Amino acid sequence: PRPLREQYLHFQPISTRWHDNDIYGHVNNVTYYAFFDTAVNTYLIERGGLDIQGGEVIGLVVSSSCDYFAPVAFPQRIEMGLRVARLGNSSVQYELALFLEGQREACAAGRFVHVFVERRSSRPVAIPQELRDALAALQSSAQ
Amino acid sequence: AMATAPRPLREQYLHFQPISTRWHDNDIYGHVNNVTYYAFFDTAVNTYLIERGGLDIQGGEVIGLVVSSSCDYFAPVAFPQRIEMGLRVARLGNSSVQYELALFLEGQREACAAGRFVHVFVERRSSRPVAIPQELRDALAALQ
Amino acid sequence: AMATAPRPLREQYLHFQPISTRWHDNDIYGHVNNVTYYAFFDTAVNTYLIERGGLDIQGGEVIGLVVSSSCDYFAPVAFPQRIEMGLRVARLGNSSVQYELALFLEGQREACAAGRFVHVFVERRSSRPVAIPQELRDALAALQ
Amino acid sequence: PRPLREQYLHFQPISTRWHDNDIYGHVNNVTYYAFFDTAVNTYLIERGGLDIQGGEVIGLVVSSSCDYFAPVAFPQRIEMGLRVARLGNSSVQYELALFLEGQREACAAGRFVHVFVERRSSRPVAIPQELRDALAALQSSAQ
């Protein structure tokens, strides 16, 4: 059952790279998680003010998963759908889907989970309110 | 801490492989990036299939497609720590196989991370599922 | 600062391609890792050869082997900065081609890095050098 | 002209990974520079006391190059030869070569150059003496 574009709120284009393709010629399964990491964090920096260089609070990835429906290959143009399934105190569950640009049905769809912690000590903390506001803005309307 | 799932132990896995860490395994927060673990899963599984199951990745008529995967991360590791992957097969079907994997520090019992993934085996050119080849089945059966 | 070589300028390159940065482009010191630049060179060149020169990477009988490369790094960039690669062909021979590339911030004139690499074109199966195919030559000639 | 094993002083085995192979089936050219980065830094940490997590001094890569003589593929076992061509005040030139384990003639050979700087400001500084001692120990005897 394949996610559709209209089921996500925010989109990030990601350009494909030569070595995204593996030996069998399609984007390797691993690379999809790099797209997930890149899509989520691009948004938290651009919209939630996240300071990756010097911020006191960082997101740890505690879990992730992906289902792969149909392949894509460098150099096809792809775009990530991003939404938030649940925003908790200090953790957040994201759902994502990769689409060919100019296509309705996702090639792959996944999820991952951030827990926000103090940079040095890794103690869980309140999502800075700026980040909270941006995360809530991605709230899934799916079903 | 991180994932709250029950942490698997070394003795739950049947085969082990060391994987050296690389400089850029670490990301900007200083530990091995979450994505990298899936590259360890891919490496551990295919190393085995080739060396023990005879898989021919260069000219073989049959290939593994990864159709789902997942991982829980319990505690960080960092380059240049030496790591090792535990592998077992949780199920072995006609055309598909589910692996369980965990990363351990070399010289240690509790998993830093654990996850799974599914291969479906298909004809190289057409991508029509075929049955897992006999020699590869035999090798996978030894991990179940 | 870093490399002391003369910094190339945008107008020295003939074709440009934006490449989005990815989370793990940054390494533990916080900027895009030196290795990543070569992945940008590979991407910029092959994107062009496919889109403009008709190269068929999936089923083509002729492939590019990278036989040498180099890079000078003048100043850092960091994910999520938007970057772009300038490309020109410095020489175009019968079977080999030398590219010059530089990375720029999108919206900027001075190169953050610059380097080169050489393709030799070979028969896919045997790796015997063949001449660069006519359609690919024509595209490369437009960058020289 | 292909470097031989006996022309290097220190060796690091590096295990190959699935996605090291690209679409044409051999380790991608880019990956060799990751091997260079990994070999040099493994040694500076293990033998020169480098503190990558919290050290005040970091190495910047200002230049690199590689010549590729013959291919290798996952899952072949490979090993990096490492030597120092010239140790300067604040910079150092490394030469490296990739060998198949159990083979004399290098598949590829390269060089790269570190400039050591203050972590925050990137001002060039004296190589901490511990690092200096380890770097001198790799001095090339080649010719």
- How far is it, in rounded angstroms, from Cα D75 to Cα D20? 9
Is D37–C42 a contact, with Cβ atoms under 8 angstroms apart?
no
- How far is it, in rounded angstroms, from Cα C129 to Cα D110? 23
> Which two tokens mark D77?
């076992």
- Is residue B78 less than 8 Å (CB to CB) from chain D? yes
> Which two tokens mark D74?
């996952």
- How far is it, in rounded angstroms, from Cα C74 to Cα C112? 5
Nearest to A18 among C18, C24, C46 (CB): C46
The 10 Å Cβ neighbour count of residue A129 is: 10
- How far is it, in rounded angstroms, from Cα C88 to Cα C16? 9
Residue D5, classed as helix, strand or coil, is helix
Contacts of A129 (CB under 8 A, 6+ apart): none
Residue with tokens 């060998």: D99
Q: Solved how?
A: X-ray
- How far is it, in rounded angstroms, from Cα B40 to Cα D17? 7
Residues from chain A that touch D23, judged by Cβ atoms under 8 A, are 21-23, 25
How many Cβ pairs closer than 8 A exist between chain B and C? 21
> Which two tokens mark D36?
């260079």
Question: What DSSP character marks residue B119?
Answer: E
Contact D64, D93 (CB under 8 A): no
Q: CATH: 3.40.50.720, 3.10.129.10, 3.40.47.10, 3.40.50.10860. Which one for B1-144? A: 3.10.129.10
| Type of residue found at A114 | H
From the list A62, A59, A64, the residue with the least C-alpha distance to A45 is: A59
User: What are the residues facing C103 on neighbouring strands?
Assistant: C85, C113
Residues from chain B that touch D53, judged by Cβ atoms under 8 A, are 30, 78
Is A19–C39 a contact, with Cβ atoms under 8 angstroms apart?
yes
Rounded to the nearest angstrom, the minimum Cα separation between B101 and chain D is 15
Contact D39, D14 (CB under 8 A): yes
Q: CATH: 3.40.50.2000, 3.30.450.40, 2.60.40.1930, 3.10.129.10. Which one for D1-143? A: 3.10.129.10
Contact A94, A36 (CB under 8 A): yes
Helices (H) and strands (E) in chain B, counts: 2, 5
Residue D17, classed as helix, strand or coil, is coil
> Which two tokens mark D123?
């001002």
- How far is it, in rounded angstroms, from Cα D96 to Cα D34? 12
Residue with tokens 């030894």: B142
- C107: phi then psi, degrees, rounded to nearest 5: 80, 55
Q: Is residue C114 within a helix (H) or strand (E), and if so which, with residue range?
A: strand C113-123
From A115, which residue of chain B is nearest by alpha-carbon distance? B2
Residue A137, classed as helix, strand or coil, is helix
Contact B114, B8 (CB under 8 A): yes
Q: Is residue D86 within a helix (H) or strand (E), and if so which, with residue range?
A: strand D78-87
Contacts of C60 (CB under 8 A, 6+ apart): C124
- A89: phi then psi, degrees, rounded to nearest 5: -50, -60
Is A119–B29 a contact, with Cβ atoms under 8 angstroms apart?
yes
Radius of gyration for the alpha carbons in chain C, expressed in angstroms and rounded:
16
> Which two tokens mark B116?
């799974």
Cis previous bond, B18, omega within 30? no
Nearest to C73 among D24, D52, D63 (CB): D63
From the list B122, B76, B67, the residue with the least C-alpha distance to B99 is: B67
What strands lie across the sheet with A108-118, from one edge to the other? A10-14, A78-87, A91-100, A108-118, A57-68, B62-73, B113-123, B96-105, B83-92, B15-19
- How far is it, in rounded angstroms, from Cα D42 to Cα B21? 9
User: What are the residues facing D91 on neighbouring strands?
Assistant: D115
